[PDB]
Protein backbone atom coordinates (compact mmCIF):
# COMPACT_ATOMS: atom_id res chain seq x y z
CA UNK A 1 0.00 0.00 0.00
CA UNK A 2 1.56 3.24 -1.26
CA UNK A 3 -0.55 6.35 -1.84
CA UNK A 4 -0.29 9.25 -4.29
CA UNK A 5 -1.47 12.83 -4.02
CA UNK A 6 -5.07 12.87 -5.21
CA UNK A 7 -6.20 9.27 -4.68
CA UNK A 8 -9.27 8.32 -2.63
CA UNK A 9 -9.28 6.54 0.73
CA UNK A 10 -11.53 5.85 3.71
CA UNK A 11 -10.77 6.21 7.41
CA UNK A 12 -10.79 3.05 9.53
CA UNK A 13 -9.29 3.01 13.04
CA UNK A 14 -8.25 -0.39 14.40
CA UNK A 15 -10.85 4.32 21.51
CA UNK A 16 -13.08 7.22 22.64
CA UNK A 17 -11.10 10.06 21.10
CA UNK A 18 -12.71 11.06 17.79
CA UNK A 19 -15.11 9.43 15.32
CA UNK A 20 -15.20 10.20 11.64
CA UNK A 21 -14.63 6.48 11.09
CA UNK A 22 -16.03 5.70 7.68
CA UNK A 23 -15.86 8.87 5.61
CA UNK A 24 -14.17 9.26 2.22
CA UNK A 25 -11.84 11.94 0.90
CA UNK A 26 -8.88 12.87 -1.32
CA UNK A 27 -5.21 12.77 -0.32
CA UNK A 28 -3.87 16.32 -0.51
CA UNK A 29 -0.45 15.57 1.03
CA UNK A 30 1.79 12.56 1.69
CA UNK A 31 4.48 13.11 4.32
CA UNK A 32 6.92 10.44 5.49
CA UNK A 33 5.13 9.47 8.69
CA UNK A 34 1.51 10.21 7.76
CA UNK A 35 -0.95 11.22 5.05
CA UNK A 36 -3.37 14.11 4.78
CA UNK A 37 -7.00 14.06 3.67
CA UNK A 38 -9.71 16.67 3.26
CA UNK A 39 -13.39 16.15 4.02
CA UNK A 40 -16.38 18.31 3.10
CA UNK A 41 -18.46 18.76 6.27
CA UNK A 42 -22.05 20.03 6.37
CA UNK A 43 -21.69 23.24 8.41
CA UNK A 44 -25.43 23.69 8.90
CA UNK A 45 -26.31 23.95 5.21
CA UNK A 46 -22.88 24.59 3.65
CA UNK A 47 -20.00 22.30 2.71
CA UNK A 48 -16.82 23.58 4.34
CA UNK A 49 -13.69 21.47 4.15
CA UNK A 50 -11.73 20.13 7.10
CA UNK A 51 -8.11 19.12 6.52
CA UNK A 52 -7.36 16.05 8.64
CA UNK A 53 -3.91 14.48 9.04
CA UNK A 54 -4.21 10.73 9.56
CA UNK A 55 -1.45 8.14 9.94
CA UNK A 56 -0.32 5.50 7.47
CA UNK A 57 -1.92 2.36 8.87
CA UNK A 58 -5.28 4.01 9.69
CA UNK A 59 -6.26 4.43 6.01
CA UNK A 60 -7.01 2.10 3.12
CA UNK A 61 -7.81 2.44 -0.57
CA UNK A 62 -11.39 2.45 -1.81
CA UNK A 63 -13.35 0.38 -4.32
CA UNK A 64 -16.21 2.87 -4.71
CA UNK A 65 -15.41 3.31 -8.43
CA UNK A 66 -14.72 -0.23 -9.66
CA UNK A 67 -18.25 -1.14 -10.74
CA UNK A 68 -18.54 1.92 -12.97
CA UNK A 69 -15.40 0.93 -14.89
CA UNK A 70 -16.34 -2.74 -15.14
CA UNK A 71 -19.79 -1.78 -16.43
CA UNK A 72 -18.35 0.61 -19.01
CA UNK A 73 -16.17 -2.20 -20.34
CA UNK A 74 -19.10 -4.63 -20.40
CA UNK A 75 -21.02 -1.91 -22.25
CA UNK A 76 -18.19 -1.54 -24.77
CA UNK A 77 -18.52 -5.28 -25.38
CA UNK A 78 -22.32 -5.16 -25.69
CA UNK A 79 -22.18 -2.19 -28.07
CA UNK A 80 -19.50 -3.86 -30.17
CA UNK A 81 -21.97 -6.71 -30.59
CA UNK A 82 -24.88 -4.32 -31.21
CA UNK A 83 -22.90 -2.81 -34.07
CA UNK A 84 -21.77 -6.25 -35.29
CA UNK A 85 -25.44 -7.12 -35.81
CA UNK A 86 -28.80 -5.37 -35.80
CA UNK A 87 -29.84 -6.10 -32.23
CA UNK A 88 -31.88 -4.42 -29.54
CA UNK A 89 -29.42 -4.65 -26.66
CA UNK A 90 -31.01 -2.59 -23.83
CA UNK A 91 -27.87 -1.41 -22.04
CA UNK A 92 -29.75 0.49 -19.32
CA UNK A 93 -30.18 -1.03 -15.89
CA UNK A 94 -33.61 -1.60 -14.39
CA UNK A 95 -34.97 -1.39 -10.84
CA UNK A 96 -36.14 -4.63 -9.27
CA UNK A 97 -39.55 -5.57 -10.61
CA UNK A 98 -42.73 -7.17 -9.23
CA UNK A 99 -43.11 -10.91 -9.63
CA UNK A 100 -45.35 -12.79 -12.06
CA UNK A 101 -47.91 -15.56 -11.70
CA UNK A 102 -47.02 -19.05 -10.46
CA UNK A 103 -48.55 -22.42 -9.54
CA UNK A 104 -47.28 -24.13 -6.39
CA UNK A 105 -47.76 -27.87 -6.01
CA UNK A 106 -48.75 -29.77 -2.86
CA UNK A 107 -47.57 -33.22 -3.95
CA UNK A 108 -44.75 -33.98 -1.55
CA UNK A 109 -45.60 -30.85 0.43
CA UNK A 110 -48.89 -30.84 2.33
CA UNK A 111 -49.43 -27.54 4.18
CA UNK A 112 -48.88 -27.96 7.90
CA UNK A 113 -51.02 -25.75 10.11
CA UNK A 114 -49.41 -24.14 13.12
CA UNK A 115 -50.95 -22.03 15.88
CA UNK A 116 -49.20 -19.65 18.29
CA UNK A 117 -47.74 -20.98 21.53
CA UNK A 118 -48.74 -20.24 25.16
CA UNK A 119 -47.04 -17.90 27.70
CA UNK B 1 36.24 20.58 54.23
CA UNK B 2 34.71 24.03 54.77
CA UNK B 3 31.10 24.40 55.66
CA UNK B 4 28.57 24.14 52.81
CA UNK B 5 26.92 27.40 51.73
CA UNK B 6 25.74 28.37 48.24
CA UNK B 7 23.05 31.09 48.16
CA UNK B 8 22.14 32.10 44.61
CA UNK B 9 18.70 33.50 43.84
CA UNK B 10 18.73 32.55 40.12
CA UNK B 11 16.40 35.50 39.33
CA UNK B 12 13.38 33.27 39.80
CA UNK B 13 13.69 33.44 43.56
CA UNK B 14 13.97 37.20 43.05
CA UNK B 15 10.99 37.63 40.72
CA UNK B 16 8.80 35.24 42.73
CA UNK B 17 9.75 37.02 45.97
CA UNK B 18 9.32 40.61 44.82
CA UNK B 19 5.70 39.59 44.32
CA UNK B 20 3.98 36.90 46.36
CA UNK B 21 4.35 33.72 44.32
CA UNK B 22 4.47 30.99 46.95
CA UNK B 23 5.79 27.49 46.24
CA UNK B 24 3.50 24.64 45.28
CA UNK B 25 2.27 21.94 47.63
CA UNK B 26 3.96 19.03 45.79
CA UNK B 27 1.09 16.63 46.45
CA UNK B 28 0.96 14.11 43.61
CA UNK B 29 2.04 13.20 40.10
CA UNK B 30 -1.22 11.87 38.58
CA UNK B 31 -3.96 13.69 36.67
CA UNK B 32 -7.40 12.42 35.64
CA UNK B 33 -7.97 11.58 32.00
CA UNK B 34 -11.55 12.05 30.83
CA UNK B 35 -12.22 9.35 28.22
CA UNK B 36 -10.38 7.35 29.07
CA UNK B 37 -11.10 6.68 32.72
CA UNK B 38 -7.63 6.25 34.19
CA UNK B 39 -5.20 8.35 36.24
CA UNK B 40 -2.48 8.55 33.61
CA UNK B 41 0.68 10.14 35.12
CA UNK B 42 1.17 13.72 33.93
CA UNK B 43 4.81 12.75 33.40
CA UNK B 44 6.16 9.35 34.41
CA UNK B 45 4.43 6.85 32.12
CA UNK B 46 2.95 7.76 28.73
CA UNK B 47 2.70 11.26 30.19
CA UNK B 48 -0.17 13.39 28.93
CA UNK B 49 2.40 15.30 26.88
CA UNK B 50 3.42 12.27 24.81
CA UNK B 51 -0.18 11.75 23.67
CA UNK B 52 -0.42 14.02 20.63
CA UNK B 53 2.48 11.82 19.48
CA UNK B 54 0.39 8.64 19.14
CA UNK B 55 -2.99 10.26 18.51
CA UNK B 56 -4.65 8.52 15.58
CA UNK B 57 -5.42 11.83 13.83
CA UNK B 58 -4.41 15.39 14.64
CA UNK B 59 -6.68 17.64 12.52
CA UNK B 60 -3.80 19.97 11.53
CA UNK B 61 4.39 19.05 7.35
CA UNK B 62 3.43 16.61 10.11
CA UNK B 63 1.94 18.55 13.06
CA UNK B 64 3.03 16.02 15.68
CA UNK B 65 6.70 16.40 14.77
CA UNK B 66 6.31 20.17 14.96
CA UNK B 67 4.81 19.74 18.44
CA UNK B 68 7.80 17.62 19.47
CA UNK B 69 10.16 20.31 18.17
CA UNK B 70 8.28 23.03 20.07
CA UNK B 71 8.60 21.03 23.29
CA UNK B 72 12.32 20.43 22.73
CA UNK B 73 12.87 24.15 22.23
CA UNK B 74 11.51 24.96 25.69
CA UNK B 75 13.53 22.13 27.25
CA UNK B 76 16.74 23.50 25.77
CA UNK B 77 15.81 27.05 26.78
CA UNK B 78 15.30 25.92 30.38
CA UNK B 79 18.71 24.25 30.41
CA UNK B 80 20.32 27.39 28.97
CA UNK B 81 18.64 29.59 31.58
CA UNK B 82 19.95 27.30 34.31
CA UNK B 83 23.50 27.45 32.93
CA UNK B 84 23.33 31.25 32.76
CA UNK B 85 22.09 31.52 36.35
CA UNK B 86 24.85 29.19 37.53
CA UNK B 87 27.38 31.35 35.68
CA UNK B 88 26.04 34.41 37.51
Amino acid sequence: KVYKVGDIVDIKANMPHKFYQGKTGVVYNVTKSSVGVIINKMVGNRYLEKRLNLRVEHIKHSKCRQEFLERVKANAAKRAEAKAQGVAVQLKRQPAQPRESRIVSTEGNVPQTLAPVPY
Amino acid sequence: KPLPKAKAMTKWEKFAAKKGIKPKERAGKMIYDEASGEWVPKWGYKGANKKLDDQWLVEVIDPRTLNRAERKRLVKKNEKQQRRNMKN
Side-chain angles (χ1 to χ4, degrees):
Chain A
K1 318 168 227 64
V2 159
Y3 308 85
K4 286 155 280 210
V5 204
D7 201 281
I8 311 138
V9 279
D10 40 42
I11 317 200
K12 192 185 63 75
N14 36 295
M15 297 283 160
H17 182 272
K18 205 167 309 171
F19 302 107
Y20 290 81
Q21 190 62 19
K23 321 282 177 148
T24 290
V26 50
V27 199
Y28 81 128
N29 172 16
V30 181
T31 187
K32 191 163 152 179
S33 38
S34 101
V35 318
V37 195
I38 67 134
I39 272 175
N40 258 291
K41 273 295 191 138
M42 201 85 264
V43 282
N45 251 15
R46 273 83 34 188
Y47 275 123
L48 272 291
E49 65 99 335
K50 286 189 208 147
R51 279 164 294 188
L52 279 55
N53 195 306
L54 261 278
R55 281 166 99 88
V56 194
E57 73 189 2
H58 285 320
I59 267 176
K60 193 60 210 112
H61 272 291
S62 32
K63 321 176 208 76
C64 88
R65 220 191 166 218
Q66 312 268 77
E67 197 37 67
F68 175 49
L69 264 69
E70 213 208 67
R71 170 159 31 86
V72 176
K73 313 307 270 310
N75 263 273
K78 292 187 185 186
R79 192 166 259 238
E81 200 264 8
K83 99 179 330 187
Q85 288 100 37
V87 191
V89 83
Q90 221 269 350
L91 301 174
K92 270 197 188 187
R93 276 169 299 174
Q94 289 300 131
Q97 296 267 343
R99 312 181 293 238
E100 309 272 355
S101 94
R102 288 122 73 138
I103 322 176
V104 321
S105 55
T106 64
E107 266 66 84
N109 189 347
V110 74
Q112 49 226 5
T113 131
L114 81 172
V117 274
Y119 96 90
Chain B
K1 295 160 184 172
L3 279 167
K5 24 194 277 192
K7 319 314 161 172
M9 273 46 70
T10 56
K11 194 171 179 195
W12 160 258
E13 307 177 280
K14 298 175 193 169
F15 169 79
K18 177 46 202 313
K19 43 205 320 172
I21 298 181
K22 289 184 299 181
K24 34 196 49 181
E25 222 253 68
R26 264 177 48 87
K29 197 217 258 211
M30 321 293 281
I31 63 142
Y32 190 74
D33 185 48
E34 37 186 10
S36 197
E38 307 290 279
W39 273 93
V40 67
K42 177 158 148 190
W43 79 277
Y45 186 7
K46 207 62 192 156
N49 336 297
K50 281 78 97 161
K51 184 187 50 57
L52 263 159
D53 274 28
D54 210 319
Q55 202 176 308
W56 79 284
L57 86 86
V58 251
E59 187 243 300
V60 306
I61 177 65
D62 193 295
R64 326 197 179 109
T65 333
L66 156 80
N67 176 28
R68 271 181 241 142
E70 188 259 10
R71 258 194 274 118
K72 191 136 189 282
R73 150 165 299 109
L74 304 142
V75 189
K76 299 297 156 178
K77 193 198 194 188
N78 202 319
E79 179 157 16
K80 176 170 182 162
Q81 296 182 232
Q82 162 197 59
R83 284 179 329 211
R84 171 166 241 143
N85 265 329
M86 209 169 45
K87 185 45 210 191
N88 280 338

Short mmCIF file of all heavy atoms in Angstrom, two decimals, chain A residues 8-12 19-25 37-41 52 62:
data_model
loop_
_atom_site.label_atom_id
_atom_site.label_comp_id
_atom_site.label_asym_id
_atom_site.label_seq_id
_atom_site.Cartn_x
_atom_site.Cartn_y
_atom_site.Cartn_z
N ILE A 8 -8.11 8.35 -3.52
CA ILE A 8 -9.27 8.32 -2.63
C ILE A 8 -9.08 7.20 -1.62
O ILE A 8 -8.62 6.11 -1.96
CB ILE A 8 -10.57 8.12 -3.43
CG1 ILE A 8 -10.62 9.10 -4.60
CG2 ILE A 8 -11.77 8.31 -2.54
CD1 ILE A 8 -11.14 8.48 -5.88
N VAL A 9 -9.46 7.48 -0.37
CA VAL A 9 -9.28 6.54 0.73
C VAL A 9 -10.38 6.75 1.75
O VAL A 9 -11.06 7.78 1.76
CB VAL A 9 -7.90 6.70 1.41
CG1 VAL A 9 -6.82 5.98 0.62
CG2 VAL A 9 -7.56 8.17 1.56
N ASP A 10 -10.56 5.77 2.63
CA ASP A 10 -11.53 5.85 3.71
C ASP A 10 -10.83 5.62 5.04
O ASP A 10 -9.82 4.92 5.13
CB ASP A 10 -12.65 4.83 3.52
CG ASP A 10 -12.15 3.51 3.00
OD1 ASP A 10 -11.10 3.04 3.49
OD2 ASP A 10 -12.81 2.93 2.11
N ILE A 11 -11.38 6.24 6.09
CA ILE A 11 -10.77 6.21 7.41
C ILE A 11 -11.31 5.03 8.20
O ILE A 11 -12.52 4.82 8.26
CB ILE A 11 -11.03 7.53 8.16
CG1 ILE A 11 -10.84 8.71 7.21
CG2 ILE A 11 -10.12 7.65 9.36
CD1 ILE A 11 -10.61 10.02 7.92
N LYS A 12 -10.41 4.26 8.80
CA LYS A 12 -10.79 3.05 9.53
C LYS A 12 -9.78 2.83 10.65
O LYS A 12 -8.65 2.40 10.38
CB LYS A 12 -10.85 1.85 8.60
CG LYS A 12 -11.52 0.63 9.20
CD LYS A 12 -11.44 -0.55 8.25
CE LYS A 12 -10.00 -0.96 7.99
NZ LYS A 12 -9.41 -1.69 9.15
N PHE A 19 -14.42 10.37 16.20
CA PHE A 19 -15.11 9.43 15.32
C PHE A 19 -15.61 10.08 14.03
O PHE A 19 -16.77 10.51 13.95
CB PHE A 19 -16.24 8.75 16.08
CG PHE A 19 -15.78 8.04 17.31
CD1 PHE A 19 -16.05 8.55 18.56
CD2 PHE A 19 -15.08 6.85 17.21
CE1 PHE A 19 -15.63 7.89 19.70
CE2 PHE A 19 -14.65 6.19 18.34
CZ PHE A 19 -14.93 6.70 19.59
N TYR A 20 -14.74 10.13 13.02
CA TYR A 20 -15.20 10.20 11.64
C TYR A 20 -15.52 8.78 11.16
O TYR A 20 -16.67 8.45 10.87
CB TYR A 20 -14.13 10.84 10.75
CG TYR A 20 -13.94 12.31 10.99
CD1 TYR A 20 -13.16 12.77 12.04
CD2 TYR A 20 -14.51 13.25 10.15
CE1 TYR A 20 -12.97 14.12 12.26
CE2 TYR A 20 -14.33 14.60 10.36
CZ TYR A 20 -13.56 15.03 11.42
OH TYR A 20 -13.38 16.37 11.62
N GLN A 21 -14.49 7.94 11.10
CA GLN A 21 -14.63 6.48 11.09
C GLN A 21 -15.62 6.01 10.01
O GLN A 21 -16.70 5.51 10.29
CB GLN A 21 -15.03 6.00 12.48
CG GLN A 21 -14.98 4.50 12.67
CD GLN A 21 -13.60 3.92 12.49
OE1 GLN A 21 -12.60 4.64 12.57
NE2 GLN A 21 -13.53 2.63 12.25
N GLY A 22 -15.21 6.19 8.76
CA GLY A 22 -16.03 5.70 7.68
C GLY A 22 -16.44 6.77 6.69
O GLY A 22 -17.46 6.63 6.00
N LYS A 23 -15.66 7.83 6.61
CA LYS A 23 -15.86 8.87 5.61
C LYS A 23 -14.97 8.57 4.40
O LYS A 23 -14.36 7.51 4.31
CB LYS A 23 -15.60 10.23 6.22
CG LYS A 23 -16.12 10.36 7.63
CD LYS A 23 -17.62 10.56 7.65
CE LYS A 23 -18.15 10.60 9.07
NZ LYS A 23 -19.33 11.50 9.20
N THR A 24 -14.90 9.50 3.46
CA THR A 24 -14.17 9.26 2.22
C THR A 24 -13.71 10.58 1.64
O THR A 24 -14.52 11.48 1.42
CB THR A 24 -15.06 8.51 1.21
OG1 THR A 24 -15.27 7.17 1.66
CG2 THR A 24 -14.41 8.48 -0.14
N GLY A 25 -12.40 10.70 1.39
CA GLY A 25 -11.84 11.94 0.90
C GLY A 25 -10.66 11.76 -0.05
O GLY A 25 -10.38 10.65 -0.49
N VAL A 37 -5.76 14.13 4.42
CA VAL A 37 -7.00 14.06 3.67
C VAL A 37 -7.80 15.32 3.93
O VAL A 37 -7.56 16.05 4.90
CB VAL A 37 -7.82 12.80 4.03
CG1 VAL A 37 -8.90 12.52 3.01
CG2 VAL A 37 -6.91 11.60 4.17
N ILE A 38 -8.75 15.61 3.04
CA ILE A 38 -9.71 16.67 3.26
C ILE A 38 -11.10 16.05 3.19
O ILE A 38 -11.33 15.04 2.53
CB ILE A 38 -9.58 17.82 2.25
CG1 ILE A 38 -9.96 17.36 0.85
CG2 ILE A 38 -8.15 18.30 2.20
CD1 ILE A 38 -10.86 18.34 0.14
N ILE A 39 -12.04 16.68 3.89
CA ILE A 39 -13.39 16.15 4.02
C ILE A 39 -14.37 17.31 4.04
O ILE A 39 -14.23 18.24 4.84
CB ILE A 39 -13.53 15.28 5.29
CG1 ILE A 39 -13.14 13.84 4.99
CG2 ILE A 39 -14.93 15.34 5.84
CD1 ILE A 39 -13.13 12.94 6.20
N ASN A 40 -15.36 17.27 3.15
CA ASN A 40 -16.38 18.31 3.10
C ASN A 40 -17.43 18.03 4.17
O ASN A 40 -18.17 17.04 4.08
CB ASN A 40 -17.03 18.35 1.72
CG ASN A 40 -16.51 19.49 0.87
OD1 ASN A 40 -16.78 20.66 1.14
ND2 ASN A 40 -15.76 19.15 -0.17
N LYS A 41 -17.51 18.90 5.18
CA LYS A 41 -18.46 18.76 6.27
C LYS A 41 -19.62 19.73 6.08
O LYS A 41 -19.43 20.88 5.66
CB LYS A 41 -17.80 18.99 7.62
CG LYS A 41 -17.16 17.75 8.22
CD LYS A 41 -18.20 16.70 8.55
CE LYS A 41 -17.61 15.57 9.38
NZ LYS A 41 -18.53 15.15 10.48
N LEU A 52 -7.80 16.99 7.62
CA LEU A 52 -7.36 16.05 8.64
C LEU A 52 -6.01 15.46 8.25
O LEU A 52 -5.69 15.36 7.06
CB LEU A 52 -8.37 14.92 8.82
CG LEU A 52 -9.61 15.13 9.69
CD1 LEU A 52 -10.43 16.33 9.24
CD2 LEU A 52 -10.47 13.88 9.68
N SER A 62 -9.95 2.61 -1.67
CA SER A 62 -11.39 2.45 -1.81
C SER A 62 -11.73 1.78 -3.14
O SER A 62 -11.01 1.92 -4.13
CB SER A 62 -12.10 3.80 -1.72
OG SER A 62 -11.28 4.84 -2.24
#
